[PDB]
Paper text:
Residue 38 is located in the middle of the helix α2, which together with helices α1 and α3 form the 18-helix barrel at the center of the hexamer. Consistent with the previous structural assessment by NMR33 and compared to WT CA, [name] CA exhibits subtle changes that are dispersed over a wide region. The affected residues are located proximal to the site of mutation in helices α1 (E29, K30), α2 (P34, E35, V36, I37, mutation site A38, M39, S41, A42), and in the neighboring intra-hexamer subunit (marked with ΄) in helices α1΄ (L20΄, E28΄), and in α3΄ (T54΄). Moreover, the changes extend downstream from the site of mutation, altering the preceding loop between helices α1 and α2 (A31, F32, S33). Thus, the [name] mutation initiates a cascade of subtle changes that alter the network of intra-protomer (CANTD-CACTD), as well as inter-protomer (CANTD-CANTD΄ and CANTD-CACTD΄΄) interactions, thus altering the structure of three neighboring subunits within a hexamer. The structural changes cause a decrease in the calculated interface area (IA) at the inter-CA interfaces that likely results in the observed broad destabilization and “loosening of the CA structure”. Under these conditions, [name] CA does not assemble into tubular structures; however, tubular assembly was rescued by T216I. The vast majority of CypA-DsRed puncta disappeared in less than 5 minutes after membrane permeabilization of the [name] viruses.
During maturation of [name] virus type 1 ([name]-1), capsid proteins (CA) assemble into a conical core (or capsid) surrounding the viral genome. Formation of a core with optimal stability is a strict requirement for efficient [name]-1 infection. CA folds into two distinct domains connected by a linker: the N-terminal domain (CANTD), composed of seven α-helices and a single β-hairpin, and the C-terminal domain (CACTD), composed of a 310-helix and four α-helices. The cores comprise ~250 CA hexamers and 12 CA pentamers.
Numbering used by the authors:
A (entry chain A), B (entry chain A), C (entry chain A), D (entry chain A), E (entry chain A), F (entry chain A): 1 to 4, 7 to 221
Write the structure that this text describes.
Amino acid sequence: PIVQQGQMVHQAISPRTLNAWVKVVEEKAFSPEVIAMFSALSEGATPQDLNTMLNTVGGHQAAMQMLKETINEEAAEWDRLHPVHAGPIAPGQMREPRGSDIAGTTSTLQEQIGWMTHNPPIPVGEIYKRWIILGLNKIVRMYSPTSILDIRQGPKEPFRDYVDRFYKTLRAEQASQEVKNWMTETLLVQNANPDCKTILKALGPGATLEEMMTACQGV
Amino acid sequence: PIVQQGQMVHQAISPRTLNAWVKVVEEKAFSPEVIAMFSALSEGATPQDLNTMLNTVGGHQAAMQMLKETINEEAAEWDRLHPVHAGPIAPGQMREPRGSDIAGTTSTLQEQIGWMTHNPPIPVGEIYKRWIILGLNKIVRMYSPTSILDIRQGPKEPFRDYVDRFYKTLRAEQASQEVKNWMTETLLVQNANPDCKTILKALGPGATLEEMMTACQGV
Amino acid sequence: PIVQQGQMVHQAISPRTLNAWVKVVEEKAFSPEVIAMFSALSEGATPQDLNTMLNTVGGHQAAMQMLKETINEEAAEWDRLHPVHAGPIAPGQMREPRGSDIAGTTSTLQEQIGWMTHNPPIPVGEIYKRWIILGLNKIVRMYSPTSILDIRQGPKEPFRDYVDRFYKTLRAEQASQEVKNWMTETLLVQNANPDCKTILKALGPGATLEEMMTACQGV
Amino acid sequence: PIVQQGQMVHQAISPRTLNAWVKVVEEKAFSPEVIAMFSALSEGATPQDLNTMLNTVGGHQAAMQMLKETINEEAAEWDRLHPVHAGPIAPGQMREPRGSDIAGTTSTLQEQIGWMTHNPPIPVGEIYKRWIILGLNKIVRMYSPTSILDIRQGPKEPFRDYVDRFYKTLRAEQASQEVKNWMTETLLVQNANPDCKTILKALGPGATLEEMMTACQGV
Amino acid sequence: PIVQQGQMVHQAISPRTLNAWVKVVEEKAFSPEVIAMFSALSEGATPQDLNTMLNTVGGHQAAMQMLKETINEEAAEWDRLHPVHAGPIAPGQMREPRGSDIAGTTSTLQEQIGWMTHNPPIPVGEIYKRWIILGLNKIVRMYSPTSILDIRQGPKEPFRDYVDRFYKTLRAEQASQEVKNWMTETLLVQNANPDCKTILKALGPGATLEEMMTACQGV
Amino acid sequence: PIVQQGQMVHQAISPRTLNAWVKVVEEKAFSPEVIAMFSALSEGATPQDLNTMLNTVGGHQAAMQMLKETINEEAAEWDRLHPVHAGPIAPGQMREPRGSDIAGTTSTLQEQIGWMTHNPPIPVGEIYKRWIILGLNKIVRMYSPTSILDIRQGPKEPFRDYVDRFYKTLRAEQASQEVKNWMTETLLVQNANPDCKTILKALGPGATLEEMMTACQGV
Ligand SMILES: [Cl-]
Ligand SMILES: [Cl-]
Ligand SMILES: [Cl-]
Ligand SMILES: [Cl-]
Ligand SMILES: [Cl-]
Ligand SMILES: [Cl-]
Ligand SMILES: [Cl-]
Ligand SMILES: [Cl-]
Ligand SMILES: [Cl-]
Ligand SMILES: [Cl-]
Ligand SMILES: [Cl-]
Ligand SMILES: [Cl-]
Ligand SMILES: [Cl-]
Ligand SMILES: [Cl-]
Ligand SMILES: [Cl-]
Ligand SMILES: [Cl-]
Ligand SMILES: [Cl-]
Ligand SMILES: [Cl-]
Ligand SMILES: [Cl-]
Ligand SMILES: [Cl-]
Ligand SMILES: [Cl-]
Ligand SMILES: [Cl-]
Ligand SMILES: [Cl-]
Ligand SMILES: [Cl-]
Ligand SMILES: [Cl-]
Ligand SMILES: [Cl-]
Ligand SMILES: [Cl-]
Ligand SMILES: [Cl-]
Ligand SMILES: [Cl-]
Ligand SMILES: [Cl-]
């Protein structure tokens, strides 16, 4: 990665960042917390470090291939919006990057460092990072076993655990924040068990989750 | 985070800070020492690092949603007290942050760094940190199984263990320091077993905890 | 903490310092080596880092409350000896700290850093550290099960192990160095088994521990 | 390695980089993720650090000898393309390296540092690294047990696992990207079980892997 | 410790240095490799760091008391050879240290840093370190179970293991290098079993250990 | 060690370098990868750090004594080739080192640092390192159980494992690169089982190890 005297300086990815990432993928497979951990360990990372984290993943090669295809689609879109102009790169200048240069496959470390440290800066690491997080979101969608519509509270299930399951499944859903707001406003109270459902409906439509959980504590 | 030649310099969150936090949440669930550990690992942290620590938490998504709602309430309060003024940001200036900018959802890393390193400084990391600790206190309240009124000394229980339980439950209570002072002055001596209660009452109302524990040592 | 180009620079407490301290308290409970480890891990620490180490302790809340009361007594004594003078803090100056400012409860990180880096320096971290070590000494006193007067050598016990026990119990005793010198000069030879006691008395009152241990080696 | 004030500074290889590499070779034997981990841990490395990583490998000495022979072939090719010219090295100059100087066997650390920090730079570490990755690719080829032509989907095998196996075996194949593209376009759909094969053929030749996996989800 | 821009800068003792030392004392008790590890972890250490390493030792308080007495004897000797002169410390000067100042009991961290960074330097850390290593040598002497005169080769014992035992016991012996040279020249060949003894005596008095071990390989 | 602003700066040996070395010697005893690990962990090391690594080795004191004798022989040879000249060391100069000064037994840390940072540099650390690696090579020779002449392929042994054994034993042999080349050209094909031997002889005398291993894959 690169960390900011004032100037931004280059640095190699640490061995325990790599070991942490590999352990995370080995243990947790693909889940939202794996994506959060990815963005955590890849702060200020170059495309070389991102490809470094991706290529060290053993197994799960179906998901890795899906991620490759997503990255290729985003790169082709970048090439459509940003057409490269033929010509000689002038002294004191750097070429404009392609989608493959952002993915680190056709660019050198010096070129990525120059794009990132330039003023104005071309943040290739955060763009490639954006594409990677997109594909990872697709993977987490495909590998989620349950749908949010099937999360129902058991007859003897404490409301707390039911909320744990509900928002666990909701975090993996692929829907805009408005759709998830609707799911919270409708499905959470709708799919509770009758004993808790009646009380929550007695609370009102504008209650917080704290009030809903403290209401069905005894039930 | 950011650490202070004299100037404050930016730095990425370390992998063992993240691993420490994730291990803490996995092992201890939600307790006061988890909050102390959070403030410990988040010294000088930016909102990006705070969201980094929060999003890497697997499970406990009910508590995470409650924390989201609390953060949204504090952000709306900030927006009420601090209304943004429409206009063009002048050269050599930075915009005043919203509640969502403090929460790191609508602000960039450069903007947070600029707000924190400015003179006068706008400490967005400590404000967002304050909100997070508030919501975490609410969670620790809701998830505490026992009330302080139910902590009673067993007939054969050593006074030391009874004090351990009493202040363990007291640390999770949500009450001002004056209320907790009253609880110490009344409930601790009131709820001891008769053999120790009579001796402590023979000591007097102004004895320290050291004197109370060394008094009921033999009992 | 703060580490000394020549200038003293601030730094956040490391995650493995915290993990080391928490592991120490979890494993060893309260013993002299725990205090030595505390002073070890808290070299150059600010009151914020000291409160950081104290608040991360799970359990043992009776001892933590005793430590709080001791810190409050030392703070009240500081307030008695150092009365604050009402007035406006002049430009280029910093206010004189209270006992609560030394304990880090009513002071900011910038104020502690300014007090510590000033010339003349107000070492709030070493003062608060002194109070903490005092209270910890009180706790170690209260939680010591055995008295030094009860450490007696068994009939078949090697003298070496008896000395191990004797100085183990002596390290936890609360007595000035002169009293401990008297205990070494009297109780050690007095409480040995007769076979070793007679030989040690044949050595003389001015023998070293090396000579005493090498004398009763065969016995 | 060497990390970039602006100047490139030398640094010794860290003990946990070495321990990470040795653990990787001990656990995973020879696989593509081992190569990715090698390039990960050897960012900015000198030939001395590369030989350091190679020589610390216990066992697998057949593969290490094959790697030695490959490195010798690449070095002889470098000597053929770059003939050394006899003469005295002028003041303010450095000799042009041989293949053995790139492999670090006949060059000193100061000479490698000088070649890498020079302008124009002679990147001996990335050249030797290239040769090493070449030989490692040969080894991974030889030690792959299965061919891509034999990866067939079981009758009750979920399509996801079959894709995992297919691209796992494909990653170890030695073929240009065009040949692997043909393998993806032909063998993947050809070697699926009939129930999934018919559906995938109903999709069309231009479907993505995401669509192919979400199509045969229920089958 | 203190590490050398050119100037010597102060630094706090690392948590894994402490953990390493504590683990070493817990596992290996008192042996020569423990002393080597002490000098290893205490490179450039101040008396505060040395007392830090010593006080964190749990148990073995007999040996710790012996070490205290040895340190006190060396300190009294220093006070005899270096008498302090009464007077006022002049501006731009520092007082000459006592034996207790070298032991870190009556001196501050600033005074130790000033003594060590001065020109001419007063190396209090290496002097106190010398005393500590002396006392540790006394302890290792007292706690050695076997004498070098009792190390004899078994009838079926390989010569290699017998040499391992011989020099293991010899490393713990308290004798000058000349005495140990005599022990090597006499006892090693004298105490071997007859089958190996006759061959070694056939070699001659001037053979190396390599020749002696390769001679009795088959026996 | 010492790491290169441009100037070479001194640094203490890290605790995990020491722990890594001690673990390596404890686990692997004496093998070539132990020597590679030694040179790995001792990059830029001073004689004090080399003696630090050597003295922390518990057990194996026969090998350590052999290493001492080898170091003494190399030191005596250095004294023969480099005779010290009697006289006063001039201001702005440093004395020429003896063999014992290179071994770190009769020289201080400041003298080693001065010898290494001087221009022209006297690399005492790499010289002492050379001697240590020499003695370690002698030890690895003596402790190798098998000779290269006895490595023969089993009747049902895969050729790959036989090559593993062959080059494992060859790496521990003490022979010049030409002798080892002859061993590769003769013994490897000579000592294979008849089924593989005939095929390898059908290949020809100029085949690579890759071709030899891929030829006897099916056998
Ligand atoms: Cl690291
Ligand atoms: Cl790869
Ligand atoms: Cl998967
Ligand atoms: Cl852009
Ligand atoms: Cl579920
Ligand atoms: Cl780290
Ligand atoms: Cl998230
Ligand atoms: Cl929870
Ligand atoms: Cl503000
Ligand atoms: Cl309880
Ligand atoms: Cl750390
Ligand atoms: Cl707290
Ligand atoms: Cl306790
Ligand atoms: Cl003061
Ligand atoms: Cl006891
Ligand atoms: Cl390291
Ligand atoms: Cl090697
Ligand atoms: Cl292998
Ligand atoms: Cl080139
Ligand atoms: Cl397979
Ligand atoms: Cl550390
Ligand atoms: Cl102590
Ligand atoms: Cl002991
Ligand atoms: Cl001196
Ligand atoms: Cl023995
Ligand atoms: Cl370290
Ligand atoms: Cl030693
Ligand atoms: Cl051995
Ligand atoms: Cl030289
Ligand atoms: Cl073998």
